[PDB]
Design a binder for these strands. Structure first.
Ligand SMILES: [K+]
Ligand SMILES: [K+]
Ligand SMILES: [K+]
Ligand SMILES: [K+]
Ligand SMILES: [K+]
Ligand SMILES: [K+]
Ligand SMILES: [K+]
Ligand SMILES: [K+]
Ligand SMILES: [Mg+2]
Ligand SMILES: [Mg+2]
Ligand SMILES: [Mg+2]
Ligand SMILES: [Mg+2]
Ligand SMILES: [Mg+2]
Ligand SMILES: [Mg+2]
Ligand SMILES: [Mg+2]
Ligand SMILES: [Mg+2]
Lengths: 115, 84, 125, 100, 206, 150, 96
RNA sequence: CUCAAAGGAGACUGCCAGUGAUAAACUGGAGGAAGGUGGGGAUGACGUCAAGUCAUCAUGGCCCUUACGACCAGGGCUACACACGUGCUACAAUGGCGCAUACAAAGAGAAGCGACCUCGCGAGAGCAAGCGGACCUCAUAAAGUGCGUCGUAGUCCGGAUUGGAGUCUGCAACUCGACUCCAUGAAGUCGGAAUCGCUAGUAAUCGUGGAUCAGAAUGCCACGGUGAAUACGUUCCCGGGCCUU
RNA sequence: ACCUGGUCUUGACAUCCACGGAAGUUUUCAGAGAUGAGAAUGUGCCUUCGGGAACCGUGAGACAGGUGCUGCAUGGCUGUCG
């Protein structure tokens, strides 16, 4: 129900439900469940409180949620403070991985802004 | 990124210059065209002027800069915005 | 003695051996049902025998290679038709009327330069 | 292509042939896991010293007749235009217009 | 519109290849380059020898070159002196042992390459283009050509506006693959610029 | 076409029920040449329909078809500054083609979870003259009735 | 056993060369000539000097392949095959 | 027997009936694998657009010649308020995912294709056969099918973007490579006016290979699998041919 | 093929002439490299022991070079109506 300071969906299968945690994807979700000895198909509601506690211990092994967000924020901040090319791209809100900017790049640039 | 087994890449001429500069003491900024050379721990505290294609841009190496290529800190294209 | 026919459809080539038997069909050392999951494929294979009413009167040993399930089924049907005509000449007239005798000459049309496919043209403005 | 551009290719081929054995040695040292880290480091530095034109990747296939750097075909060693001219004259053995 | 090369379309139908050797991908490009350099040398060397076609064969590790010339004597030289000189040069170019065979071309008026070369020579000599073309057509038809077409393109008569002029007599069925069409081209280099000549000679079906 | 040299293309009868009409319906439902997928939907839908219908699958399908088939349709003809919808009798082959296409279109627009369920529901509604497919037939007839003068 | 692989760009030339080999060997037992699959190498080139991407020529070189098997070769037969000179344009590979 | 690839056979409006000017021809029929151009391709008249290409090359003239020539390093051709063309991937349940399991064609390969085995989550690495190839290798067909699950949600749809960690090629991947792993999880719920392709093994959809190439395809060229709908017709719109005005 | 900077001027690429050096091979330092300054090792091939030519240089000057312009001076090739 409540893991890593968030509420996971009870109705969903455990493997899907765990992915609700930031920093946990399908692979990590499967690993956590395998370590906890809980089947992926089992719904969170079906799991006992003891079973939920085992899941909580497994999640604690990986950096997740706020701790992950802090790490990601610091990494981007470092680049921007460095003034490296990547940092400059983060500052300008342009693609950082050498994609084209003549067209596209709408995800970084946002909606088209008329001249 | 360059394979770990191959190790970090630096141009030999730059490496020699850095070693000489470190041995000599505080020095006038090193002038290099080797944008591709990785920044090494020994370089920290040295100013390296990296060519951006038209001018050598002074870079003061710091601990955070280590493990990055020199060219990363010298911008090749100039853009001040459209209709600016 | 075994009566033999060769059937071809698309890129498939089928070798059919027909002998007096009791409605047993083997394709590439597998039962018809096993080899062909699709009902249509099975229907195509059994079409000639049903027409001649010799479904349970003969045993068929069939080997087919190349193409796909529909091609192989069509090739087998052609081969069976040929074998049936070898077994009995009179059957030809009925088989011809069914259109089993004709070898289907339709093939994949080649891709052509300046075209996305055989006929599909790039979008025009 | 300009005469100089054709000349540059001739130099690149020559240098590549000259240092082929040396380059292969150095690359093998760098590649080998068993080789010492110091040995690898020296090999990496030595490879840099060798002339850039010695690397085969620097060479660009050019039409042997014209020196055209695009539309090259390896089989004939000619660009598409020169291939076509030779083919029509019957100079390229076995080669004819094809339909299927 | 544009037309298919008449020789190229007929290759392996009624027209033979000029080069007839087998090579793997490894040697194919080198053989083509050697053939080019051999043909380049021979064309320059035998410019006045009325060479129509140079056939190159590569049996074993040797090169056999067959030169088709209207004037066999001049190519051969005195006691085969000239041909021997050619052989030595070809061997150097080829880098393999060279054998030179000289084939006489009878009826040079019926040979497209020779006709084209004649016309271009005349144009360089400042002979009037129309006269050169008309004579060529007449000569071929007299020699029993079933048809001939001659086309000349460029600054004809040194005109500022380039134009194309052509004359045809008899049948010249370019769409008929079995028809034996000898086609060849030549370029005249003049003070006004390049003039292109194309000649088609029909010698009957098959 | 102008030449009008078009000839009939043979349709193999559907395997389960041996009906050419049902084979046409599979082709109309089919997308991207996936006939096997299409056949599964139709066979599933017909079975579900048959249970509710209490009739043979072919009979149930035929009852649905009878309700959706159009006797008359409108063809546009431009007359000067106006365009006239001209009523035309639908030939028997086209009547089936329209009925099947409309049923499939209607089924595709339904909100049921699977296409087989949607198709069964559409087919059942048509038997009782209630679905969007039957409404299209109603609209076509009304348009033809309105333009009977032309 | 001697295996001879013949390759030519011309089918007529290869057939003549095989016929010479089989006859010469017959004057040891021979298997075939076996018609091995012809390789068709196709090439596509733009035919304009500039642009016109849809304007192309498609070329093909067909490599014809023949296999002849010389079984229980006589010493004379072996020499006779070596002495035999096939037409130029036929590549001959002899396998023992 | 399949197949390989050489040489042959076969289709001719040849046969039959009707129609037509005792015509050409048309229509139907028989036989036949194939029927009237059997399917596809190559093949492009005289000419038109002073159409495209002096940057493939060649060439008249003009121009530069210690420079408009030549060499080198670094940068650029990858820029980014924006507009357009051509594509790719989607918006899901005729689907996604998991597991199991069928059936191709075509092609490439020696500074190459590289098995097996071992190692790595993987990209790969190490070791090392075979193959200049109907032999060996690339190399797994995928859609499909069975079973299970998901249950109409911005989702177990979508996979953009970004962080971190790697691999490989290459002197060298900062500008500016491909790929892998973990995490992240954008727009998008079927698209205004308008507009494109396609008449059958076609469209649609599904994979496969090749050239270029150290590396770098959603492009191009090629290959099979599955496999439709519809054509009443010629009033209309558009273009073309012929005769006439 | 563009830019910035560093460089060369019979020249990166040809023919010719004179002159000196086999060609080459292995290394050092400086330089971003181009390149320059060095060192060491080869010194053959032909050869009427006249020699040549192999290929390095150096020095002229005839020349080389140009993806510089004109596709409205052209050839060739191509699209297009079709
Ligand atoms: K997550
Ligand atoms: K010019
Ligand atoms: K970019
Ligand atoms: K694309
Ligand atoms: K890069
Ligand atoms: K590549
Ligand atoms: K008119
Ligand atoms: K032109
Ligand atoms: Mg296809
Ligand atoms: Mg295109
Ligand atoms: Mg390259
Ligand atoms: Mg113009
Ligand atoms: Mg550069
Ligand atoms: Mg570009
Ligand atoms: Mg007409
Ligand atoms: Mg023009």
């Amino acid at each position: 129900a409540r893991i890593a300071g968030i509420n996971i969906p009870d109705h969903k299968h455990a493997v899907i439900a765990l992915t609700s945690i930031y920093g946990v994807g399908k692979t990590r979700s499967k690993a956590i469940l395998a370590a906890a000895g809980i089947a992926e198909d089992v719904k969170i509601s079906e799991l006992s409180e003891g079973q939920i506690d085992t899941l909580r211990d497994e999640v604690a092994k990986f950096v997740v949620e706020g701790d992950l967000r802090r790490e990601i924020s610091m990494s981007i901040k470092r680049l921007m403070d460095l003034g490296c090319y990547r940092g400059l791209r983060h500052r300008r809100g342009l693609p950082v991985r050498g994609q084209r900017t003549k067209t596209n790049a709408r995800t970084r640039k946002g909606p088209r802004k008329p001249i | 990124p360059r394979s770990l087994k191959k190790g970090p890449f630096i141009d030999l001429h730059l490496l020699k210059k850095v070693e000489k500069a470190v041995e000599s003491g505080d020095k006038k900024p090193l002038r290099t065209w080797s944008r591709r050379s990785t920044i090494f721990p020994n370089m920290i505290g040295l100013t390296i002027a990296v060519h951006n294609g038209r001018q050598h841009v002074p870079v003061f190496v710091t601990d955070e800069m280590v493990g990055h290529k020199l060219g990363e800190f010298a911008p090749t294209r100039t853009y001040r915005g459209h209709a600016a | 003695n075994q009566y033999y026919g060769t059937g071809r459809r698309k890129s498939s080539a089928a070798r059919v051996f027909i002998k007096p038997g009791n409605g047993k069909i083997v394709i590439n050392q597998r039962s018809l049902e096993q080899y062909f999951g699709r009902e249509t494929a099975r229907m195509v294979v059994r079409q000639p025998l049903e027409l001649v009413d010799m479904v349970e009167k003969l045993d068929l040993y069939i080997t087919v290679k190349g193409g796909g399930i529909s091609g192989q089924a069509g090739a087998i049907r052609h081969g069976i038709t040929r074998a049936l005509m070898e077994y009995d000449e009179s059957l030809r007239s009925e088989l011809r009327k069914a259109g089993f005798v004709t070898r289907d000459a339709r093939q994949v049309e080649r891709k052509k330069v300046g075209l996305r496919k055989a006929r599909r043209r790039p979008q025009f403005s | 292509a300009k005469q100089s551009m054709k000349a540059r290719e001739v130099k690149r081929v020559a240098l590549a042939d000259k240092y082929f054995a040396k380059r292969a040695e150095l690359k093998a040292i760098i590649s080998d896991v068993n080789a010492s880290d110091e040995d690898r480091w020296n090999a990496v530095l030595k490879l840099q010293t060798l002339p850039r034109d010695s690397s085969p990747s620097r060479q660009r296939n050019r039409c042997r007749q014209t020196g055209r750097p695009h539309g090259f075909l390896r089989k004939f060693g000619l660009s598409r235009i020169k291939v076509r001219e030779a083919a029509m004259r019957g100079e390229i053995p076995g080669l004819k217009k094809a339909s299927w | 519109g544009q037309k298919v090369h008449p020789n190229g379309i007929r290759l392996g139908i009624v027209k033979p290849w000029n080069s007839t050797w087998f090579a793997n991908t490894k040697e194919f490009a080198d053989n083509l380059d050697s053939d080019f350099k051999v043909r380049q040398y021979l064309t320059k060397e035998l410019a006045k020898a009325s060479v129509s076609r140079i056939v190159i064969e590569r049996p074993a590790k040797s090169i056999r070159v067959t030169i088709h010339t209207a004037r066999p004597g001049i190519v051969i030289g005195k006691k085969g002196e000239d041909v021997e000189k050619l052989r030595k040069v070809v061997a150097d170019i080829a880098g393999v042992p060279a054998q030179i065979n000289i084939a006489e071309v009878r009826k040079p008026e019926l040979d497209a390459k020779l006709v084209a070369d004649s016309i271009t020579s005349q144009l360089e000599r400042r002979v009037m283009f129309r006269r050169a073309m008309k004579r060529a057509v007449q000569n071929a038809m007299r020699l029993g050509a079933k048809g001939i077409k001659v086309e000349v393109s460029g600054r004809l008569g040194g005109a500022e506006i380039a134009r194309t002029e052509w004359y045809r007599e008899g049948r010249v069925p370019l769409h008929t693959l079995r028809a034996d069409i000898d086609y060849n081209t030549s370029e005249a280099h003049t003070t006004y610029g390049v003039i292109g000549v194309k000649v088609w000679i029909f010698k009957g079906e098959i | 076409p102008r030449r009008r040299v078009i000839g009939q293309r043979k349709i193999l009868p559907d395997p389960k029920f041996g009906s050419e009409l049902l084979a046409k319906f599979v082709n109309i439902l089919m997308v991207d040449g996936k006939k096997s997928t299409a056949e599964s939907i139709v066979y599933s839908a017909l079975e579900t329909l048959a249970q509710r219908s209490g009739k043979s699958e072919l009979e149930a399908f035929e009852v649905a078809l009878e309700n959706v088939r159009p006797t008359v349709e409108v063809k546009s003809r431009r007359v000067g500054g106006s365009t006239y919808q001209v009523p035309v009798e639908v030939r028997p082959v086209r009547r089936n083609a329209l009925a099947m296409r409309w049923i499939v279109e209607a089924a595709r627009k339904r909100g049921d979870k699977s296409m087989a369920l949607r198709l069964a529901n559409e087919l059942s509604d048509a038997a009782e003259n209630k679905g969007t497919a039957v409404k299209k037939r109603e609209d076509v007839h009304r348009m033809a009735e309105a333009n009977k003068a032309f | 056993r001697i295996r001879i692989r013949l390759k030519a760009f011309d089918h007529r030339l290869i057939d003549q060369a095989t016929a010479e080999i089989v006859e010469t060997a017959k004057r040891a037992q021979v298997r075939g000539p076996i018609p091995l699959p012809t390789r068709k190498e196709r090439f596509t080139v733009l035919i304009s000097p500039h642009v016109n991407k849809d304007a192309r020529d498609q070329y093909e070189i067909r490599t014809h392949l023949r296999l002849v098997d010389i079984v229980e070769p006589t010493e004379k037969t072996v020499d006779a095959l070596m002495r035999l000179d096939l037409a130029a344009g036929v590549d001959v590979q002899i396998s023992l």
